[PDB]
Amino acid sequence: HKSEVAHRFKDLGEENFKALVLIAFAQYLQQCPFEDHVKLVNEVTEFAKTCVADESAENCDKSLHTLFGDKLCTVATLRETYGEMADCCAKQEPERNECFLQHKDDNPNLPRLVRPEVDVMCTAFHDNEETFLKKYLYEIARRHPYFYAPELLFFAKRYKAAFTECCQAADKAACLLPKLDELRDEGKASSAKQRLKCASLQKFGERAFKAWAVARLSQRFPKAEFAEVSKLVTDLTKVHTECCHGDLLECADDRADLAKYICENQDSISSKLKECCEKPLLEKSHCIAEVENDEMPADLPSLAADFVESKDVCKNYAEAKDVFLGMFLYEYARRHPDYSVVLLLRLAKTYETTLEKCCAAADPHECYAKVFDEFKPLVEEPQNLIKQNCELFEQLGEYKFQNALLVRYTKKVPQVSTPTLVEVSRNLGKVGSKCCKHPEAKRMPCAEDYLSVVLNQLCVLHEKTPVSDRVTKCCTESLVNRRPCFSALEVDETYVPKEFNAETFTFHADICTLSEKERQIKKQTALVELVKHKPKATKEQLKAVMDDFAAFVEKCCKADDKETCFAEEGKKLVAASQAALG
Ligand SMILES: CCCCCCCCCCCCCC(=O)O
Ligand SMILES: CCCCCCCCCCCCCC(=O)O
Ligand SMILES: CCCCCCCCCCCCCC(=O)O
Ligand SMILES: CCCCCCCCCCCCCC(=O)O
């Protein structure tokens, strides 16, 4: 209407409004105390209500941008705390807003946010639920000022439900700790996934992005016509482009518009949207993004007629190459919800390479007659990797699977740090356990998505402290080529072994009184260092050692003296091992 603020307040509801205002202020004023933000929230909410009562009331017809920037510029310590950010206030909109946006600090220097003990958390949750949760929301938003505010709200509500259920359980910790871990990991991945999509857009351009959206939306909405998918791809590309620039309101409005269009057109798109489309504005976009794949229509024909048989392939291609490739991609993807999106794009690139060569060659239709054959080994490559790795997972369990991976990747890239090798290997093993309990139909997209996050963490860490030319290569490739680049890593025959360090392999009784988790990580750290010291060590030779180390740890955590069993048996274990592996 006349009043954007009034209109937001009506659409979100007072509770969501207050939480979004808190996140937004926290994201821009990363260094003000919680109590300051509480007071800004209350003033803004007060003013909002006046508008709701009367859109003609004073100031109620200013833009949300103008109101927000005005409010920021009234912060008394703005120059003293934020330095050059206060210079934004000398500008008029929209420059002022742009200026504010650029001064968000993606790397604030704040202490890590520690998880308190369970009884401490549950007690504060009971004694003042609202401030417990809102102060958490503030601590998180100010540490991640680009994280999309409504998704951050969706996480906050899941935490609230976590505390609600677990703080009244018999074993509070056993209930609560798994949920907090799950949520922390989902959140960190979700944020790493937003960042990664924006970086890929930048580096690879808008056409690769559109290719990716085609494949993905085509899998999702297999009954939509190409021109409907193409339309969503164009809109989605705009949404993601604007959301990467970072203005909350511009991103939210784009996301709302698309959700609305989709909901007004369910019968052209998918039959699984009814639920999402009935949800309030706040949750619509999010629910649609997560909607399960529609059913494939059923009597769909071979792509042969259109894409290989037809006289006109080269004509139809030449007339609009991306549209033709896009149609190829659409028809492929909609028939294959069981493929990774990156597999579909390799196949599209193969087809494109083939048309480019064949359509300019002596006999086009002869030249590309056999193109679909090129696809077979690109499909089977990941399928067979999934079966080889998942069989290994079933034989070993998760922990021993992680150990095999640790041995595996240490030999390939022994220049990687141990903590990186250990974190990534543990994490890849978690992808094992997650995705290998899916049936075939769902295995490839599972791995793609979870691998995408682990192999991005790997790349993130590594480009921060570079050490392997091979890893930097795989990290700087197209996202299409990232994972196969990693699967092609070969043992580093060039590697000079690490020199023996007695400390590295000295163990104390404190390890008997460590978490299951933390003991594992110390055993896995030693395993890596064992491989880094004896890289040519054999599978039988490694297992001999592990079996002895295992015996050792039971023995020395089972005695009346602990301290010296660990020093005494230790010296013995290490001696035995150093001559077993020659
Ligand atoms: C109608 C939307 C445009 C779709 C363009 C199709 C391009 C398909 C083949 C090339 C694959 C690009 C993958 C990449 O380089 O990241
Ligand atoms: C005395 C109260 C003055 C009212 C403050 C303005 C309320 C609107 C807040 C808009 C927050 C959105 C931030 C953004 O995306 O840039
Ligand atoms: C699977 C596509 C269905 C379309 C649903 C529209 C929502 C996508 C918006 C994406 C960009 C927003 C920023 C983010 O939260 O990552
Ligand atoms: C280089 C010779 C010193 C060898 C010392 C033994 C190192 C043992 C670490 C093995 C990790 C145990 C695997 C496990 O059971 O979790």
DSSP 98-113: HHHHHT--SS------
Cβ neighbour number for residue 473 with a 10 Å cutoff: 13
Q: Which residue CA neighbors atom 11 of ligand 3 most closely?
A: 240
List of long-range contacts for 347-354, beta carbons under 8 Å, 24+ apart: 347/375, 347/378, 347/379, 348/211, 348/215, 349/480, 350/374, 350/375, 350/378, 351/307, 351/325, 352/321, 352/325
User: Residue 172 and residue 166: Cα distance in Å, rounded?
Assistant: 5
Cβ neighbour number for residue 224 with a 10 Å cutoff: 21
Q: Provide the resolution (angstroms).
A: 2.0
Show the CA angle centred on residue 198, arms to residues 226 and 429, nearest 5°. Answer: 95
- Site to substitute for ligand 3 among 153, 228, 243, most atoms within 8 A of C-beta: 243
Task: Name the binding residues.
Answer: 1, 4, 11, 65, 238, 242, 245, 247, 250, 253, 257
Query: Is the CB of 22 within 6 Å of ligand 2?
Result: no
* 70 exposure class (CB count in 10 Å sphere: 0-12, 13-18, 19+): middle
User: Residue 315 and residue 307: Cα distance in Å, rounded?
Assistant: 12
Q: Locate 7 and state its tokens.
A: 């209109």
User: Residue 246 and residue 252: Cα distance in Å, rounded?
Assistant: 10
Show the CA angle centred on residue 537, arms to residues 535 and 541, nearest 5°. Answer: 155
Find the 505 Cα to ligand 4 centroid distance in Å. Answer: 8
SS3 308: helix
User: Residue 60 and residue 67: Cα distance in Å, rounded?
Assistant: 9
User: Residue 490 and residue 206: Cα distance in Å, rounded?
Assistant: 33
Close Cβ partners of 331 (under 8 Å, ≥ 6 residues apart): 303, 306, 307
List of long-range contacts for 386-391, beta carbons under 8 Å, 24+ apart: 386/435, 386/436, 386/443, 386/444, 386/447, 389/432, 389/436, 390/432, 390/435, 390/436, 390/443
Burial 490-525 (b: 16+ CB within 10 A, else e): eebeebeebeeeeebbebebeeeeeeeeebbbebbb
Query: Minimal CA–CA distance to 527: which of 406, 416, 430, 415?
Result: 406
What values do phi and psi take at 75, rounded to 5? -60, 125
Among the residues of 320-370, which ranges form H helices? 321-335, 341-359, 364-368
Q: Which residue CA neighbors atom 10 of ligand 1 most closely?
A: 349
Query: Is the CB of 345 within 6 Å of ligand 1?
Result: yes
Query: Minimal CA–CA distance to 130: which of 15, 238, 261?
Result: 15
CA distances from 534 to 214, 546, 552 (A): 48, 14, 20
Give the position, in ligand 1's atom list, of the atom nearest the Cα of 352: 9
Q: Which residue CA neighbors atom 4 of ligand 3 most closely?
A: 289
Find the 551 Cα to ligand 4 centroid distance in Å. Answer: 11
Closest-approaching ligand to the CA atom of 403: 4
User: Residue 267 and residue 508: Cα distance in Å, rounded?
Assistant: 66
Find the 479 Cα to ligand 1 centroid distance in Å. Answer: 13
393 close to 386: Cβ distance less than 8 angstroms: no
Query: Is the CB of 67 within 6 Å of ligand 2?
Result: yes
Burial 168-191 (b: 16+ CB within 10 A, else e): eeeebeebbeebbeeeeeebebbb
Closest-approaching ligand to the CA atom of 344: 1
User: Residue 482 and residue 242: Cα distance in Å, rounded?
Assistant: 26
Which residue intervals of the chain bear CATH 1.10.246.10? 3-105, 106-195, 203-294, 295-380, 381-492, 493-572
Strand ranges, E, within 219-359: none
Cβ neighbour number for residue 377 with a 10 Å cutoff: 9
531 close to 406: Cβ distance less than 8 angstroms: yes
User: Residue 446 and residue 461: Cα distance in Å, rounded?
Assistant: 23
- Site to substitute for ligand 2 among 38, 44, 61, 70, most atoms within 8 A of C-beta: 44
Task: Name the binding residues for Zn(2+).
Answer: 65, 245, 247
Task: Name the binding residues for (4Z,15Z)-bilirubin IXalpha.
Answer: 238
User: Residue 38 and residue 103: Cα distance in Å, rounded?
Assistant: 22
What values do phi and psi take at 429, rounded to 5? -55, -35
Close Cβ partners of 337 (under 8 Å, ≥ 6 residues apart): 219, 222, 293, 296, 441, 445
Q: Locate 322 and state its tokens.
A: 């991306």
Q: Locate 359 and state its tokens.
A: 């359509």
Q: Which amino acid is at 459?
A: C
Query: Is the CB of 24 within 6 Å of ligand 2?
Result: yes
CATH code that applies to domain 493-572: 1.10.246.10
Q: What residue has token string 């494949």?
A: 215
Return the CATH number of 295-380, one of 1.10.246.10, 2.30.42.10, 3.20.20.220, 3.40.50.720. Answer: 1.10.246.10
User: Residue 359 and residue 187: Cα distance in Å, rounded?
Assistant: 47
Find the 486 Cα to ligand 3 centroid distance in Å. Answer: 28
Query: Is the CB of 9 within 6 Å of ligand 2?
Result: no
Task: Name the binding residues for Cu cation.
Answer: 1
User: Residue 220 and residue 205: Cα distance in Å, rounded?
Assistant: 23
Query: Is the CB of 30 within 6 Å of ligand 1?
Result: no
Close Cβ partners of 502 (under 8 Å, ≥ 6 residues apart): 574
Find the 529 Cα to ligand 4 centroid distance in Å. Answer: 9
Give the position, in ligand 4's atom list, of the atom nearest the Cα of 578: 2
Find the 418 Cα to ligand 4 centroid distance in Å. Answer: 14
Query: Is the CB of 325 within 6 Å of ligand 1?
Result: yes
Query: Is the CB of 6 within 6 Å of ligand 2?
Result: no
- Site to substitute for ligand 2 among 3, 67, 147, 152, most atoms within 8 A of C-beta: 67
Close Cβ partners of 23 (under 8 Å, ≥ 6 residues apart): 137, 141, 149, 152, 153
CATH code that applies to domain 381-492: 1.10.246.10
Cβ neighbour number for residue 567 with a 10 Å cutoff: 16
Fold of 106-195: Serum Albumin; Chain A, Domain 1 (1.10.246)
CA distances from 526 to 222, 348, 460, 576 (A): 49, 44, 24, 16
Query: Is the CB of 64 within 6 Å of ligand 2?
Result: yes
Asked, as a colleague might, if the bond just before 178 is cis with ω within 30 of 0, I would say no
573 close to 552: Cβ distance less than 8 angstroms: yes
* 33 exposure class (CB count in 10 Å sphere: 0-12, 13-18, 19+): exposed
Q: Please give the method by which this entry was determined.
A: X-ray
Show the CA angle centred on residue 162, arms to residues 161 and 163, nearest 5°. Answer: 95
Fold of 3-105: Serum Albumin; Chain A, Domain 1 (1.10.246)
Query: Minimal CA–CA distance to 204: which of 230, 162, 241?
Result: 241
Among the residues of 14-128, which ranges form H helices? 14-28, 34-53, 64-74, 78-82, 95-102, 118-127
What values do phi and psi take at 249, rounded to 5? -70, -40
88 close to 100: Cβ distance less than 8 angstroms: yes
Find the 105 Cα to ligand 3 centroid distance in Å. Answer: 24
SS3 523: helix
328 close to 307: Cβ distance less than 8 angstroms: yes
Q: Locate 19 and state its tokens.
A: 């939480």
Closest-approaching ligand to the CA atom of 579: 4
* Class for the domain spanning 203-294: mainly alpha
- Site to substitute for ligand 1 among 325, 330, 334, 341, most atoms within 8 A of C-beta: 325
